[PDB]
Specification:
It contains three helices and 32 strands. It has a five-stranded antiparallel β-sheet with strand order 12-13-19-15-16, with no helix packed on it. The chain is rod-shaped and about 120 Å long. The N and C termini lie far apart (122 Å). Calcium ion binds next to strand 32. GO terms for molecular function: metal ion binding. This is Fimbrial subunit.
Length: 411
């Protein structure tokens, strides 16, 4: 039998796309059953026939890497997306040298580097020519998540944001050359400090990263890893950033949203990868108290003193007197009112619906205006929920108003 190449034959390329760690094992070009990772559907591959002649050209001069292929591209191309078991088949292929590139991939996928394939090929000199080439390209799934720890933290109380992100994987020629966290903070927020930067289970020191100054940087936070920092990062490590903030005021809406970004190099293609987190929400509103004379019609009262408590009901006071923005006692003004700017809603915390919505606020009247008796009970429980603060009474959307009555002493 002849061992020659049959140039009246047509070849094929079969890609078995995998989600996982790179193959530092040079592939046979034949079937391998290397299901180390999970099959990845949705990745598109583009093959490009190169000018090189297998029939009459010098094979010693043929490209062996994606870099050597540059400048030898032809108009003959084909695009296929992975479908069943993360498989893309390129059929009725003219014999020749092809460049294989990833054109599209799903969200969070860090693609592998482009590669070169010969149709036909041999793994070993003793093998028969192989016209049906099989390759196992690799990819890495990198997820980015944002959480908020803001339970019982009112206006000017420090609360934290935490950004979690999967670092990419890198081969032994390849490396992680850049890695940063970006977060555009709402104008109502004041950055406090970065509390923790973690690479896997390794808590980094302040020499391993840099912090910009959000106040003079349009309220945008940037936390970049230095050269020292990067050295501590291992392939595919779970990166973490916890930083502290204070909400200055309630503002125009009860809700305050946060979303962040992670930017790193693709170790294989060296091109920048931006990854965006989910959006998290913190809710605060204002509490307005109006002191009224119970028996004397349409009359407000100056000089009524109050304290604020956490409570399950008016008969059962919890934490308090509470300090909200350096004040732990409020007195009604010349208009018979005061406004606490502001408090954490009782029905939504740490980024989710409160379970159970048992928390309430309690106003304790500590002193009645001159010539007025101290009401009994002197405690008013408040259902400070998003829905109740949202109600309007033109007689607003971010303020909940509480009417409290006092009666003149003696009679
Ligand atoms: Ca309201």
């Amino acid at each position: 039998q002849r061992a020659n190449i049959d140039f009246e034959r047509k070849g094929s390329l079969t890609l078995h796309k995998k989600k996982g760690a790179e193959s530092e094992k040079r592939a046979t070009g034949k079937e391998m059953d290397d299901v180390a990772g999970e099959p990845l559907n949705g990745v598109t591959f583009k093959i490009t026939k190169l000018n090189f002649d297998l029939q009459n050209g010098d094979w010693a001069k043929f490209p062996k890497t994606a870099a050597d292929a540059k400048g030898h591209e032809t108009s003959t191309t084909k695009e296929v997306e992975t479908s069943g078991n993360g498989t893309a088949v390129f059929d009725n292929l003219d014999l020749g040298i092809y460049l294989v590139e990833e054109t599209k991939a799903p969200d969070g996928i860090v693609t592998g580097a482009p590669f070169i394939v010969s149709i036909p090929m041999v793994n070993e000199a003793s093998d028969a020519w192989n016209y049906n080439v099989v390759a196992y390209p690799k990819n890495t799934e990198t997820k980015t998540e944002k959480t908020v720890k803001d339970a019982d933290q009112n206006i000017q109380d420090a609360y934290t944001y935490t950004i979690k992100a999967d670092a990419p994987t890198w081969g032994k020629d390849k490396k992680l050359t850049a890695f940063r966290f970006e977060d555009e903070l709402d104008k109502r927020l004041d950055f406090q400090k970065v509390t923790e930067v973690k690479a896997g289970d390794t808590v980094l020191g302040t020499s391993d990263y840099t912090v910009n100054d959000p106040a003079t940087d349009g309220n945008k936070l940037v936390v970049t890893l230095t050269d020292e920092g990067l050295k501590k990062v291992k392939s595919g490590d779970k990166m973490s950033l916890t930083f502290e903030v204070k909400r200055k005021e309630v503002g125009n809406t009860t809700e305050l949203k946060n979303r962040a970004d992670v930017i790193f190099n693709n170790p294989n293609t060296d091109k920048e990868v931006k990854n965006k987190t989910n959006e998290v929400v913190t809710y605060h509103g204002k509490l307005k108290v109006v002191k009224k004379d119970g028996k004397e019609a349409g009359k407000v009262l100056k000089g009524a003193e109050f304290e604020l408590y956490q409570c399950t009901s008016a008969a059962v006071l919890g934490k308090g007197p509470l300090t909200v923005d350096g004040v732990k006692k409020w007195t009604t003004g010349d208009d018979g009112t005061f406004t606490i700017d502001g408090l954490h809603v009782t029905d939504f915390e740490d980024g989710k619906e409160a379970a159970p919505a048992t928390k309430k606020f309690c106003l304790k009247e500590t002193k009645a205006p001159a010539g007025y008796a101290l009401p009994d009970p002197n405690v008013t429980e408040i259902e400070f929920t998003r829905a109740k603060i949202s109600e309007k009474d033109k007689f607003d959307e971010v303020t909940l108003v509480s009417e409290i009555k006092n009666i003149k002493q003696g009679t």
